[PDB]
Amino acid sequence: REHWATRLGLILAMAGNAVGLGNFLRFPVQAAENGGGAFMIPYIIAFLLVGIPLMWIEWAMGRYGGAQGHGTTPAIFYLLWRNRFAKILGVFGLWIPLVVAIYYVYIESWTLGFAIKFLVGLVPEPPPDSILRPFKEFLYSYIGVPKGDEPILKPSLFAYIVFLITMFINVSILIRGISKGIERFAKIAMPTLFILAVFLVIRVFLLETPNGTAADGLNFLWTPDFEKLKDPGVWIAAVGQIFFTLSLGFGAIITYASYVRKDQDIVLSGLTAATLNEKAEVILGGSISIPAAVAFFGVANAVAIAKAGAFNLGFITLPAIFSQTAGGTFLGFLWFFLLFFAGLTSSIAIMQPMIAFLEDELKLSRKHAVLWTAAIVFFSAHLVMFLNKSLDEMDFWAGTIGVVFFGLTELIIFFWIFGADKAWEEINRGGIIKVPRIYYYVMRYITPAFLAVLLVVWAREYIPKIMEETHWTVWITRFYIIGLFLFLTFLVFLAERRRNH
Ligand SMILES: CNCC[C@H](Oc1ccc(C(F)(F)F)cc1)c1ccccc1
Ligand SMILES: CC(C)C[C@H](N)C(=O)O
Ligand code: NA
Ligand code: NA
Structure with a gap:
């Protein structure tokens, strides 16, 4: 089996897995829409009660799986629970990262496209709405937002070609393997990512207009609002963000952990990777978009902008703000270059589970596993590129509801079916430090009850609206992603047949 070469390489690759587009694009939007500091309390709580315990659980399952030659959940779920149904539930751990990858790599390619255009200065120029409109139109031409009745997207030729280059970049890293590809790139990307982010945070701090400063944005984000801790919509937002942000x-995470040696520590490593992400999320990610928007527009306007769109902040508002400053075009470039490296280190992470399945279970070489995985993702992404609201549908079913459901499933299998005591032992085995004894009770009683309650409220108060009050074209996307599940179910069926022959 492939293994991580260095300790630091493992940490940086795992942090590169987590530290992604979610830190800089998803988190600011979620927080702004949920009363800033009103969002943070549920967020911190969810991090302590859901994020941390599941991180250790996934590292545990991965290392346990890898020791026996299996990187993915179809096989790992079966190892923990010798049941046919465990293999089928395990498909979600291939399905989720595949579907997510299908739209994520595409968003990632927008950041490269924008980076290029901002570096070369092929960007709009201002002559409040006269400031935003040219940048709105710039993004709308790029991705091809529908102008009329038809739910059809028309991405520019540049966007399409940049998507191809992005696929090629993802492949060039992934084809070199774990230590020589993913690890080596992480050691380059992460320091760069941190430097650019710190630079941009510092630069944003210096912004002031007659409407406010950056500090006003931080005050909005870090003033606890106790009159919102009763809204279930905020708790759903916070927990969802925690899953997404930590991968x-x-x-x-499970697949990455399957390249960790049987004996090596996962307790401190896991905690470090999780804490590195939260610092990049709340300190770096939280200090760029919102404070800049609040500084130019005030709190009320910044929230309203964050509500009328989620790519409004990162692709429209921020570059618009930057263009009003000296060297703003280059500042835009640094923003989009930061985003590109944030995305890239995470997109290689959500394609690797499919690659590892093909290698481990269907005994394909790395070359063919990577190329076939890329081909599947490349082809499928045509739905995201050309069909309006296809991105939102995949992001909901796989990247939002799917991940919470799957978190509960993996927790139940590992802690309730495999055995709580066996699970605990497997977590702590070889650890540099031990997990606090309190977390056993959290993992076994608190976390599962909390997620189960959350999913029941979710499926009764929120999913009816999405199932019923959306455009008919969502069924094309639903149909296709259900098809992907059946296809993956079929590959698992072939994998066990091949094992017998
Ligand atoms: C414009 N429609 C998309 C809604 C938006 O989707 C997103 C999907 C992916 C990402 C990112 F960039 F991957 F983090 C960020 C946002 C979203 C989803 C959930 C919560 C906030 C925003
Ligand atoms: C799907 C995951 C790899 C996403 C990543 N954790 C992020 O915050 O962008
Ligand atoms: Na993250
Ligand atoms: Na990343």
Whole structure:
């Protein structure tokens, strides 16, 4: 089996897995829409009660799986629970990261496209709405937002070609393997990512207009609002963000952990990777978009902008703000270059589970596993590129509801079916430090009850609206992703047949 070469390489690759587009694009939007500091309390709580325990659980399952030659959940779920149904539930741990990858790599390619255009200065120029409109139109031409009745997207030729280059970049890393590809790239990307982010945070701090400063944005984000801790919509938002941001329930952490040696520590390593992400999220990610928006527009306007769109902040508002400053075009470039490296280190992570399945279970070489995985993702992404609201549908079913459901599933299998005491032992085995004894009770009683309650409220108060009050074209996307599940179910069926022959 492939293994991580260095300790630091492992940490940086795992942090590169988590530290992604979610830190800089998803988190600011979620927080702004949920009363800033009103969001943070549920967020911190969810991090302590859901994020941390599941991180250790996924590292545990991965290392346990890898020791026996299996990187993905179809096989790992079966190892923990010798039942046919465990293999089928395990498909979600291939399905989720595949579907997520299908739209994620595409968003990632927008950041490269924008980076290029901002570096070369092929960007709009201002002559409040006269400031935003040219940048709105710039993004709308790029991705091809529908102008009329038809739910059809028309991406520019540049966007399409940049998507191809992005696929090629992802492949060039992944084809070199774990230590020589993913690890080596992480050691380059992460320091760069941190430097650019710190630079941009510092630069944003210096912004002031007659409407406010950056500090006003931080005050909005860090003033606890106790009159919102009763809204279930905020708690759903916070827990969802925690899963997405930490790459939990994507089977991606598990797959990375399957290249960790049987004896090596996962307790401190896991905690470090999780804490590195939260610092990049709340300190770095939280200090760029919102404070800049609040500084130019005030709190009320910044929230309203964050509500009328989620790519409004990162692709429209921020570059618009930057263009009003000296060297703003280059500042835009640094923003989009930061985003590109944030995305890239995470997109290689959510394609690796499919690659590892093909290698481990169907005994394909790395070359063919990577190329076939890329081909599947490349082809499928045409739905995201050309069909309006296809991105939102995949992001909901796989990257939002799917991950929470899968987190609960993997927790139940590992802690309730495999055995709580066996699970605990497997977590702590070889650890530099031990997990606090309190977390056993959290993992076994608190976390599962909390997620189960959350999913029941979710499926009764929120999913009826999405199932019923959306455009008919969502069924094309639903149909296709259900098809992907059946296809993956079929590959698992072939994998066990091949094992017998
Ligand atoms: C414009 N429609 C998309 C809604 C938006 O989707 C997103 C999907 C992916 C990402 C990112 F960039 F991957 F983090 C960020 C946002 C979203 C989803 C959930 C919560 C906030 C925003
Ligand atoms: C799907 C995951 C790899 C996403 C990543 N954790 C992020 O915050 O962008
Ligand atoms: Na993250
Ligand atoms: Na990343």
